[PDB]
Every structure is written in C-alpha cells, then in structure tokens.
C-alpha cells in the first residue's frame, strides 16, 4: 500500500478511451518520489503509468466523476 520509490519511469503515450479505465490512482509528490504519478488499472487487470503533464490525461481525471 505504501509508496517507497517512483513507480513510473516512462508513461503510456497513446491516448485511449477512458471507458477502459477501471481504477484511477493519482499519487502526489512526496518524500519517496519528486513528481506526481498516475497509475491506471485496465479491464484486464494490467496497471499502466500515464503522464499527468499530458492534456488528454488531465481530461480523463477532470471528467472521471
């Protein structure tokens, strides 16, 4: 449960439909990671790193409800 280091070195860059996102996780920068990280869980159960600096990602978060 506890973040001990950055989990995302690279992010998935190909925009896709938010309907494939079953779980959204926004992790603010802290003592163990200097940047904000976004991890998404897909329908298949696969976890994916997304770039919080990309507009399409900002929109999926802003319109997630």
């Amino acid at each position: 449960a506890k973040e001990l280091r950055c989990q995302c070195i690279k992010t998935y860059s190909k925009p896709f439909h938010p309907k494939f996102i079953k779980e959204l996780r926004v992790i603010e920068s802290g003592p163990h990671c200097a940047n904000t990280e976004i991890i998404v869980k897909l329908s298949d159960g696969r976890e994916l790193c997304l770039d919080p600096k990309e507009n399409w990602v900002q929109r999926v978060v802003e319109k997630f409800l």
Partner: antibody
Amino acid sequence: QVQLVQSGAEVKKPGASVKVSCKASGYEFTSYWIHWVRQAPGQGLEWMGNISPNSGSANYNEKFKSRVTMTRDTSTSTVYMELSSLRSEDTAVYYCAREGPYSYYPSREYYGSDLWGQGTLVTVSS
Amino acid sequence: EIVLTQSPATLSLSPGERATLSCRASQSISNNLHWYQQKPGQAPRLLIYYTSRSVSGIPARFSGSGSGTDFTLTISSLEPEDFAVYYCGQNNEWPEVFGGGTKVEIKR
C-alpha cells in the same frame, strides 16, 4: 558498445561547487534510471540520488537534498550531478549507474544497477 | 532508515572453497536485494539481482538466496578472479542502501 562515460577528476576548495557528467551510449536512454553513488576512500557505497532521463525528475537522498542537483540533456544522452557547499567529507569517487529496463507497466520487482561508469574522483581540500 | 549488515567483514578462503556471504536487512525489503562485486580501482559490478536472479555474463558459480530479512550470496567454488569486495544493495525503497561490504581474501 553499451557504456556510461564520466567526466575527469576534479579538485575543489571547501565551499565550492562541482558538476560531474555521465554520458550514456548504446542503449534506450529513457528506459533506465541513472543513480549517483559515491565512495569515500577506503569506505562503502552511498546513494546521492537519481533522475529519470525521460522527465528529468530527480530524487535525492535527504542528506544531500539541500546541495545537490541532478539534471539531464536528452539531446546528448548526458546526466549531470552538481554538488555544492563542498566539505572535506565530500572527497570521494562519484559513480553513475543505470537501473532498468523499465516501461509504462509499474512493478514491485526491481533490477539491480547493471552498468556503472568508471567513476570520477572529486577531491575537496584547502 | 534501512540498514544492511554484512557479515563477516573479511572471509579468508583458499581457491576452490565455497564462500557464503551474509546480508541482514533492518526491515523487510521484499526480494529487492542485489549483489555487487568490486575490485581495487574499479566500479562495482552487478552479480545477482532480486535475491536469486541470474545476470547476463556472470558465471554460474554465483548464486543468491533469501529468507525474510536474511540474504546470502554463495560462490560455489572460489576462482582467482573472485577475490574482491562484495556489497549487498537494496532498492525496495529510496534511498538505496548498501551494506558495508565483505572482503574475500586468499587464505595461504
């Protein structure tokens, strides 16, 4: 030729600053973290921090966070470590090291640091 | 703070003998414990990663094992090129922490 090539030996006075470089070649620059680890004469290994070559987002050891800066130049696949307010205790061989490969799939199983630069001796003396 | 304790500080062994090096972690680091070899005037070199996983180019005589916070590097039969300093390093959390090193020296 997979390599990490560091800049030459440095001699600095206390209070001064040092900037060491690490040039990466022969691999996908963005797939590996670049760590800075120092070794004081006759001592063990100490982690300074690291940087993601893609984002340039650097993580520091709380011990040096007030005086260390890590940057990268994707154009030249070069990583830099700037250490300021130098003291005698900073006299060490500074190594850069890569850890990866990683992708956009997060994991809880890590690789070790499989490739290390030749090291840079930094001497801090009056 | 994670503290990695390596024992013994020095192992004096004859070539051909088995070298067993121990690393104890102050708290759990999962299996994110790696082993490095360092020779005088050279950079450390990765031997074993993720407790027991094999590294490309490293001889088969090197093996790692781990039970909780207790880790072991075994060199099945010491060859002349194996007499060096060995460090365990964890990266389960940052800051990364290295043990104090174990020197493997030639007993004669």
